[PDB]
Amino acid sequence: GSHMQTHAARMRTFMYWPSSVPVQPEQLASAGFYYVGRNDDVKCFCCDGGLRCWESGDDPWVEHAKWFPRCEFLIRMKGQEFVDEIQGRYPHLLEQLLST
Numbered sequence: 001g002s003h004m005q006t007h008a009a010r011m012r013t014f015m016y017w018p019s020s021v022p023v024q025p026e027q028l029a030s031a032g033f034y035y036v037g038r039n040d041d042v043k044c045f046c047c048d049g050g051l052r053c054w055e056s057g058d059d060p061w062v063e064h065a066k067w068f069p070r071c072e073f074l075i076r077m078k079g080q081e082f083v084d085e086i087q088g089r090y091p092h093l094l095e096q097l098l099s100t
């Protein structure tokens, strides 16, 4: 999309985020997601991928890589190797583990 490109702008959309959803605004906004204003529906500012029905223990970066692996914002922030491993591809696991 053309909006919500900054972390601060994404955070502002969470003003009416329901307090009972077990995933928090900071986690979502960091992973590129902003609140669309209905239920627990979020969208990525970059790939426009939509996610809902957040569950306790969900990791927004893992959900981003599981559903929208070609997102250029996801790749810039987390790197192609992170996305590959979420997609079940491990030819570069040792180097990944070593590098960090």
Ligand SMILES: C[C@@H]1CN(CC(=O)N2CC(C)(C)c3ncc(Cc4ccc(F)cc4)cc32)[C@@H](CN2CCOC[C@H]2C)C[NH2+]1
Residues within 6 Å of the ligand: 036, 041, 042, 043, 049, 050, 051, 052, 053, 054, 055, 058, 063, 067
């Ligand atoms: C966090 C986790 C996500 N998960 C998948 C999910 O949310 N995806 C996967 C898919 C990309 C196929 C998809 N496409 C449309 C919508 C709808 C939408 C959401 C936001 C929005 F702004 C506008 C529309 C959701 C959605 C949940 C399980 N989902 C729940 C829905 O049915 C599919 C199922 C697999 C569990 N929680």
Ligand SMILES: [Zn+2]
Residues within 6 Å of the ligand: 032, 044, 045, 046, 047, 048, 049, 064, 068, 071, 072, 073, 074
């Ligand atoms: Zn995205």
